[PDB]
Write an enzyme that holds these catalytic residues in place. Structure first.
Site, PDB file in Angstrom:
ATOM      1  N   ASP B  71       2.373  -9.573   9.777  1.00  0.00           N
ATOM      2  CA  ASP B  71       1.855  -8.218   9.880  1.00  0.00           C
ATOM      3  C   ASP B  71       1.388  -7.962  11.307  1.00  0.00           C
ATOM      4  O   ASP B  71       0.905  -8.863  11.951  1.00  0.00           O
ATOM      5  CB  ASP B  71       0.702  -8.070   8.893  1.00  0.00           C
ATOM      6  CG  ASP B  71       1.093  -8.501   7.479  1.00  0.00           C
ATOM      7  OD1 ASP B  71       2.112  -9.212   7.339  1.00  0.00           O
ATOM      8  OD2 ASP B  71       0.383  -8.147   6.511  1.00  0.00           O
ATOM      9  N   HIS B  73       0.053  -4.601  12.039  1.00  0.00           N
ATOM     10  CA  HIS B  73      -0.901  -3.544  11.670  1.00  0.00           C
ATOM     11  C   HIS B  73      -1.458  -2.709  12.804  1.00  0.00           C
ATOM     12  O   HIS B  73      -2.678  -2.621  12.934  1.00  0.00           O
ATOM     13  CB  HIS B  73      -2.082  -4.146  10.912  1.00  0.00           C
ATOM     14  CG  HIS B  73      -1.848  -4.216   9.387  1.00  0.00           C
ATOM     15  ND1 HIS B  73      -2.203  -5.308   8.628  1.00  0.00           N
ATOM     16  CD2 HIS B  73      -1.299  -3.321   8.536  1.00  0.00           C
ATOM     17  CE1 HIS B  73      -1.882  -5.083   7.367  1.00  0.00           C
ATOM     18  NE2 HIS B  73      -1.332  -3.885   7.283  1.00  0.00           N
ATOM     19  N   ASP B  99       4.950  -4.935   8.123  1.00  0.00           N
ATOM     20  CA  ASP B  99       3.606  -4.348   8.241  1.00  0.00           C
ATOM     21  C   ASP B  99       3.182  -4.122   9.691  1.00  0.00           C
ATOM     22  O   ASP B  99       2.270  -4.764  10.195  1.00  0.00           O
ATOM     23  CB  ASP B  99       2.557  -5.173   7.465  1.00  0.00           C
ATOM     24  CG  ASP B  99       2.557  -4.856   5.957  1.00  0.00           C
ATOM     25  OD1 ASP B  99       3.085  -3.794   5.595  1.00  0.00           O
ATOM     26  OD2 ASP B  99       2.029  -5.634   5.127  1.00  0.00           O
ATOM     27  N   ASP B 102      -0.471   1.162  10.015  1.00  0.00           N
ATOM     28  CA  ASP B 102      -1.699   1.296   9.254  1.00  0.00           C
ATOM     29  C   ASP B 102      -2.638   0.172   9.580  1.00  0.00           C
ATOM     30  O   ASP B 102      -2.216  -0.861  10.067  1.00  0.00           O
ATOM     31  CB  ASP B 102      -1.436   1.318   7.746  1.00  0.00           C
ATOM     32  CG  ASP B 102      -0.545   2.476   7.317  1.00  0.00           C
ATOM     33  OD1 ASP B 102      -0.501   3.494   8.037  1.00  0.00           O
ATOM     34  OD2 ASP B 102       0.097   2.364   6.247  1.00  0.00           O
ATOM     35  N   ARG B 103      -3.913   0.389   9.282  1.00  0.00           N
ATOM     36  CA  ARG B 103      -4.968  -0.567   9.571  1.00  0.00           C
ATOM     37  C   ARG B 103      -5.360  -0.461  11.068  1.00  0.00           C
ATOM     38  O   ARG B 103      -6.440   0.021  11.405  1.00  0.00           O
ATOM     39  CB  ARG B 103      -4.494  -1.967   9.200  1.00  0.00           C
ATOM     40  CG  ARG B 103      -4.033  -2.075   7.745  1.00  0.00           C
ATOM     41  CD  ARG B 103      -5.090  -1.494   6.833  1.00  0.00           C
ATOM     42  NE  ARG B 103      -5.673  -2.456   5.894  1.00  0.00           N
ATOM     43  CZ  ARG B 103      -6.910  -2.346   5.406  1.00  0.00           C
ATOM     44  NH1 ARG B 103      -7.663  -1.323   5.783  1.00  0.00           N
ATOM     45  NH2 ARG B 103      -7.406  -3.239   4.549  1.00  0.00           N
ATOM     46  N   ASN B 131       5.039  -3.900   2.895  1.00  0.00           N
ATOM     47  CA  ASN B 131       4.402  -2.961   1.980  1.00  0.00           C
ATOM     48  C   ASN B 131       3.981  -1.689   2.634  1.00  0.00           C
ATOM     49  O   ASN B 131       4.008  -0.638   2.008  1.00  0.00           O
ATOM     50  CB  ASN B 131       3.160  -3.568   1.362  1.00  0.00           C
ATOM     51  CG  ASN B 131       3.277  -5.033   1.218  1.00  0.00           C
ATOM     52  OD1 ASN B 131       2.954  -5.783   2.142  1.00  0.00           O
ATOM     53  ND2 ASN B 131       3.769  -5.473   0.062  1.00  0.00           N
ATOM     54  N   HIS B 132       3.571  -1.791   3.891  1.00  0.00           N
ATOM     55  CA  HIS B 132       3.104  -0.629   4.628  1.00  0.00           C
ATOM     56  C   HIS B 132       4.166   0.262   5.232  1.00  0.00           C
ATOM     57  O   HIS B 132       3.845   1.237   5.904  1.00  0.00           O
ATOM     58  CB  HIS B 132       2.103  -1.065   5.690  1.00  0.00           C
ATOM     59  CG  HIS B 132       0.780  -1.434   5.116  1.00  0.00           C
ATOM     60  ND1 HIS B 132      -0.234  -0.519   4.952  1.00  0.00           N
ATOM     61  CD2 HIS B 132       0.342  -2.593   4.570  1.00  0.00           C
ATOM     62  CE1 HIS B 132      -1.246  -1.099   4.328  1.00  0.00           C
ATOM     63  NE2 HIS B 132      -0.922  -2.356   4.084  1.00  0.00           N
ATOM     64  N   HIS B 180       8.472 -10.586   2.983  1.00  0.00           N
ATOM     65  CA  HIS B 180       7.149 -10.120   3.313  1.00  0.00           C
ATOM     66  C   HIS B 180       6.212 -10.565   2.196  1.00  0.00           C
ATOM     67  O   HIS B 180       5.265 -11.307   2.428  1.00  0.00           O
ATOM     68  CB  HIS B 180       7.116  -8.601   3.422  1.00  0.00           C
ATOM     69  CG  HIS B 180       5.758  -8.063   3.736  1.00  0.00           C
ATOM     70  ND1 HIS B 180       5.252  -8.025   5.017  1.00  0.00           N
ATOM     71  CD2 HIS B 180       4.768  -7.616   2.928  1.00  0.00           C
ATOM     72  CE1 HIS B 180       4.011  -7.578   4.983  1.00  0.00           C
ATOM     73  NE2 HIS B 180       3.691  -7.323   3.728  1.00  0.00           N
ATOM     74  N   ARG B 235      -3.339  -6.907  -6.146  1.00  0.00           N
ATOM     75  CA  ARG B 235      -2.618  -5.793  -5.561  1.00  0.00           C
ATOM     76  C   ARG B 235      -2.737  -4.703  -6.596  1.00  0.00           C
ATOM     77  O   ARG B 235      -2.821  -3.530  -6.268  1.00  0.00           O
ATOM     78  CB  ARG B 235      -1.128  -6.114  -5.373  1.00  0.00           C
ATOM     79  CG  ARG B 235      -0.797  -7.241  -4.414  1.00  0.00           C
ATOM     80  CD  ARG B 235      -1.141  -6.876  -2.982  1.00  0.00           C
ATOM     81  NE  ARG B 235      -1.446  -8.064  -2.197  1.00  0.00           N
ATOM     82  CZ  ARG B 235      -1.656  -8.062  -0.888  1.00  0.00           C
ATOM     83  NH1 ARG B 235      -1.590  -6.920  -0.211  1.00  0.00           N
ATOM     84  NH2 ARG B 235      -1.938  -9.198  -0.262  1.00  0.00           N
ATOM     85  N   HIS B 262       2.160 -10.729   4.642  1.00  0.00           N
ATOM     86  CA  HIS B 262       1.460 -10.004   3.590  1.00  0.00           C
ATOM     87  C   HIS B 262      -0.025 -10.303   3.443  1.00  0.00           C
ATOM     88  O   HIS B 262      -0.828  -9.386   3.369  1.00  0.00           O
ATOM     89  CB  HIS B 262       2.176 -10.242   2.253  1.00  0.00           C
ATOM     90  CG  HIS B 262       1.829  -9.253   1.179  1.00  0.00           C
ATOM     91  ND1 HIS B 262       1.825  -7.890   1.391  1.00  0.00           N
ATOM     92  CD2 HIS B 262       1.508  -9.429  -0.127  1.00  0.00           C
ATOM     93  CE1 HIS B 262       1.513  -7.270   0.267  1.00  0.00           C
ATOM     94  NE2 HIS B 262       1.317  -8.180  -0.671  1.00  0.00           N
TER      95      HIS B 262
END
Ligand SMILES: [Ca+2]
Ligand SMILES: [Ca+2]
Ligand SMILES: [Ca+2]
Ligand SMILES: [Ca+2]
Lengths: 164, 352, 164, 11
Positions: B71, B73, B99, B102-103, B131-132, B180, B235, B262
């Site tokens: 990730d 992010h 990923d 975001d974040r 996922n993002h 991921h 999750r 992840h």
């Protein structure tokens, strides 16, 4: 002798009552409120915005709030105040030198009094920068009462700046 | 003394050379001063790389020497370092497990750059889906709003279509399944993944949701039962696979290990139980976002698989420019505080 | 003495969701504990009853306690505007840990957050003083009405509260 | 980031 002229939303009765609280706050009974007199209240010693309000209440820059200044300043919050007047007051919390424009240094100085040290100066400055960049729609490097209005208009914080 | 963001928005000519190749050292520098590229410029990059992505297989096939990443992010300035650690991608085969948004608050920068680099080196640098990379999560998180502050809703859309072309996985040096999230009760053979239609917002169930969203059991490796999948209460979707589930897929598929991101790792990675057959970690997690969310104080890491040696590189967080929540502006930010304290003062002053 | 057990009857839009009890650690931070106790009872005239959780960030915590402004700017202790930081003996170890929200050191008012995860970056800065004794499942339920900006979609209220 | 303040919410 000599009437006192002043512009306010209050009727004669309200001007009298506030006339009494002003006398109680007037420690040295000099007809003008001093900061030490303001700071005489304990609830106010723990407020980072007292000096800003006071310099805003202080229209003739003599370091004291006489009765005209006190009344007229307490009037900005009169429930009877419009929307614009309450933004204007807010706008003034930022414009320190009262030139009608919020500057990069002024926005920093004011914010710092409130945030204090939960933000390194570098951090505060950056977001002050980034705030002025997106809001400086005329490119003069400073915020006008209008540009200010364009960013905070729909927050409706004026509805909260109300006292009785 | 505080550097100030650059007012000039990069041009097509300043970004792309006359052969159409991205000028990545140019780009990269602008972006570190927080600058932006004219909308079209960006949209071009975003669409050029997605075409290359739509063309790539569900399951990529990547040969060592490779550097695997987790990730990212939005932590743009932690990416700039991941590159100083993982080596110039001019001479190194990469693979990000997803990923990138975001974040962190520089999610677009990451994207633009990684997208520009996919264009420049389409046969070396590889990106997967995390996922993002989907509408449903970027709406909840700050990417969408980010895009609108820095760019427009169009750019955000450009990205959303792009993300739908992100390969669901990769079979690295014919030994590792690089995903991921994890496995699927419904994905037993490497062939299954190949049959999946990936060009879509991930479903709220099924193999693709499970590829991206599965997590190993909190007690993976020492579970008290030989049960495979159990619904992911962490999750809230997909599944918690087990040590047996993995070794059954691994063996059946003649694979060595599973490499996924992840989940955040304090060390910036995690080796899971060693496969009875191999003595190599059945599952490997790798997190490339240092001091996650600025408070995790976690180290970051890339995985370098060269000369039959999987070397874990760790790096720490680097400095990045401040940003209030939801890219708020200092007036919106302080006005509530202001309007309360002044109210408070007058109230004590009038109750004198 | 003994450690007091308070409770909160949370309600979503009026509809009762359930009750959440808390063990207050007066054995470690007696003053802070009291403050929360007295505000749970209402016995000082003003308290938590009827207030809401204005900031709920899923996977992080539930912030509540603003019974004056209802947005995170207000609230007050039984001891006045605010009181000093007792101590940081206890640390945030995981879900259920109760602690005080503030605006810097020595600014404990009436705001607090119920952790839903292990928030160690807060240790040494915020005062840990209590834990969810029962109803963790209710707190988890409140998380669903949250968002990454804290804002909730249904009003999460403290319909009733007291000591057990 | 993840902080719990009363007045000036930070990142
Ligand atoms: Ca006086
Ligand atoms: Ca004066
Ligand atoms: Ca000025
Ligand atoms: Ca301007």
């Amino acid at each position: 002798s000599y009437p006192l002229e002043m512009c306010s939303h209050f009727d004669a009765d309200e001007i009298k009552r506030l006339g009494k609280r002003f006398k109680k706050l007037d420690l040295d009974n000099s007809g003008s409120l001093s900061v030490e007199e303001f700071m005489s209240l304990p609830e106010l010693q723990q407020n980072p915005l007292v000096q800003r309000v006071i310099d805003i209440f202080d229209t003739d820059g003599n370091g004291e709030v006489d009765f005209k200044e006190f009344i007229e300043g307490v009037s900005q919050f009169s429930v009877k105040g419009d929307k614009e007047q309450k933004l204007r007051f807010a706008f003034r919390i930022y414009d320190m030198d009262k030139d009608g424009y919020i500057s990069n240094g002024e926005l920093f100085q004011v914010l710092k009094m409130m945030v204090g040290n939960n933000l390194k100066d570098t951090q505060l400055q950056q977001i002050v920068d980034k705030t002025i960049i997106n809001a400086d729609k005329d490119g003069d490097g400073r915020i006008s009462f209008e540009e200010f209005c364009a960013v905070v208009g729909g927050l409706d914080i004026h509805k909260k700046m109300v006292v009785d | 003394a505080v550097p100030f963001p650059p007012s000039h928005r990069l041009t097509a000519k300043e970004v792309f050379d006359n052969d159409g190749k991205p000028r990545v050292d140019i780009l990269k520098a602008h972006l570190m001063k927080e600058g932006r590229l004219e909308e079209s410029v960006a949209l071009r990059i975003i669409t050029e790389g997605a075409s290359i992505l739509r063309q790539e297989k569900n399951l990529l096939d990547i040969d060592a020497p490779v550097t695997v990443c987790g990730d990212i992010h939005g932590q743009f300035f932690d990416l700039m370092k991941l590159f100083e650690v993982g080596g110039s991608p001019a001479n190194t085969r990469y693979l990000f497990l997803g990923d990138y948004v975001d974040r962190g608050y520089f999610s677009i920068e990451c994207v633009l750059y990684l997208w520009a680099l996919k264009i420049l080196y389409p046969k070396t640098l590889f990106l997967l889906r995390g996922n993002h990379e989907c509408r449903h999560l970027t709406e909840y998180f700050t990417f969408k709003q980010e895009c609108k502050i820095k760019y427009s809703e169009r750019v955000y859309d450009a990205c959303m279509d792009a993300f739908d072309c992100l390969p669901l996985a990769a079979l690295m040096n014919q030994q590792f399944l690089c995903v991921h999230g994890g496995l699927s009760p419904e994905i037993n053979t490497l062939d299954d993944i190949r049959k999946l239609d990936r060009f879509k917002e991930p479903p709220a169930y099924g193999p693709m949701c499970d590829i991206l969203w599965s997590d190993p059991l909190e007690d993976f490796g020492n579970e008290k039962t030989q049960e495979h999948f159990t619904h992911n209460t962490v999750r809230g979707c997909s599944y918690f696979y087990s040590y047996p589930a993995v070794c059954e897929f691994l063996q059946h598929n003649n694979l060595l290990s599973i490499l996924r991101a992840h989940e955040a790792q304090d060390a910036g990675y995690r080796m899971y139980r060693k496969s009875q057959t191999t003595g190599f970690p059945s599952l490997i997690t790798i997190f490339s976002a240092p001091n996650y969310l600025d408070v995790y104080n976690n180290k970051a890491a890339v995985l370098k698989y060269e000369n039959n040696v999987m070397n874990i590189r760790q790096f720490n967080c680097s400095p990045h420019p401040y940003w209030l929540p939801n890219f708020m502006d200092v007036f919106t930010w302080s006005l509530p505080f202001v309007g309360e304290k002044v109210t408070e003062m007058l109230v004590n002053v009038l109750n004198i | 003495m003994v450690n007091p057990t308070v409770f909160f009857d949370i309600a979503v839009d009026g509809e009762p969701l359930g009750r959440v009890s808390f063990e207050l650690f007066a054995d470690k931070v007696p003053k802070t504990a009291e403050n929360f106790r007295a505000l749970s009872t209402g016995e000082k005239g003003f308290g938590y009853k009827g207030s809401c959780f204005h900031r709920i960030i899923p996977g992080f915590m539930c912030q509540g306690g603003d019974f004056t402004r209802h947005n995170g700017t207000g609230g007050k202790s039984i001891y006045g505007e605010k009181f000093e930081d007792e101590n940081f003996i206890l640390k945030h170890t995981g879900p259920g840990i109760l602690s005080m929200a503030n605006a810097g050191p020595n600014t404990n008012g009436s705001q607090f957050f119920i952790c839903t995860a292990k928030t160690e970056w807060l240790d040494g800065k915020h005062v840990v003083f209590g834990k969810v004794k029962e109803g963790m499942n209710i707190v988890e339920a409140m998380e669903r009405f949250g968002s990454r900006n804290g804002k909730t979609s249904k009003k999460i209220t403290i319909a009733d509260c007291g000591q057990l | 980031x993840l902080l719990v303040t009363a007045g000036l919410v930070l990142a």
